[model samples]
Target: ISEFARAQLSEAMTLASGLKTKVSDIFSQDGSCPANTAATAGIEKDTDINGKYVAKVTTGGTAAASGGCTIVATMKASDVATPLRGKTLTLTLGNADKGSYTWACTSNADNKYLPKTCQTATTTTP
Candidate 1:
């Protein structure tokens, strides 16, 4: 268990009125957690947004443990891009080694923080 930071890492899920599905673009976080800053470890960094939808899991702040370790997670969601609101999505980033931290995110069609949703999404795992 080492220091992990999810500065820009993100994840989301949405409900779609129609059956059609949409795919989103790619995204990434800027830096990694400090070797000593154990609190920021295992926190989400960034997230992507596109259309009408909602995202639950905001950027995490801390980790369960820290050491010569990594951060790992798992996720499950519906409608990566273009979806409905109030959908439960789960994302898990497994034990990532040193200098490793990532996740998925999405935005609403309006792309406004008011409604709070994501139309497009991206997930980082490895």
Candidate 2:
């Protein structure tokens, strides 16, 4: 993962943990991420702020889809994090072809497995 992407992801995860949620099984969507690397896999938390449980993934390369190449982050649900369990959170990879896309899981039930709405820097990507 890129340094900037790592920092953003850390911030998001920290925010979620502070909200009484547990973060787990974070990895590259392609499953090619190395083990024991920063933000590659596992669970982390910190009690500091916020109230809702969330999971975020910040992308670092040119990949996409079900449509283009994409990145994914997995958040497991617990008693405190029920809002995020069994969901697939996605954000637009952006129009850049190569860059970062930071996405956070949310409670919006529009799509069964997707809670947070996907966003791009310029506009929303479908």
Candidate 3:
């Protein structure tokens, strides 16, 4: 995990904890990651201000997929700190119904951890 990615992930986990959400696993789509434990992974491929921080998360992986569903959200580099920039983040809330998923983000950092309509980042910190 790169410093930036680490910072962003830290923020995401912080948010998850607040919502009573417990993330059991996080990694790249390929199931390969730098950290053995959630706390060790860092950026391994790329780096940039607007890079990405992703987690292969499952809401009910620990228990069950309850509570309407699970929401996966990413934060923007700008919003990672403060002063929401035009740069948007992304969030995907998935479940058995709704029949589909939507992309979203928040111009507000406080809302970054939460769900909003947006897309995933084009780039990411390895």
> Top model by TM-score, which number?
2
Q: How many residue pairs clash in each candidate?
A: 47, 6, 16
Candidate 1: 10-residue stretch with minimal lDDT: 18-27
- What is the per-residue lDDT of model 2 for residues 1-126, given as tens digits with 9 covering 90 to 100? 234323333344444333221111122334222222134333222122222443443332234431122334334354223444534333322322344434344322223323124322345789
- The TM-score of predicted model 3 comes to 0.25
Per-residue error at 43 for model 3, in Å? 32
Candidate 3 residues 7-125, lDDT tens each? Answer: 56455544434322222233112222222123333322111212334333223222223212233333543545443322233222233234433222222343333333322234667
Query: lDDT tens string, model 1, 2-97?
Result: 111111113223321110111000112322222212223333222222232233233332332221122222222443322223433323232334
Return whichever of 2 and 3 wins on TM-score.
2
lDDT of 3 at 59: 32
Cα lDDT for residue 81, model 3? 44
What ranking of all candidate models by TM-score puts the best one first? 2, 3, 1
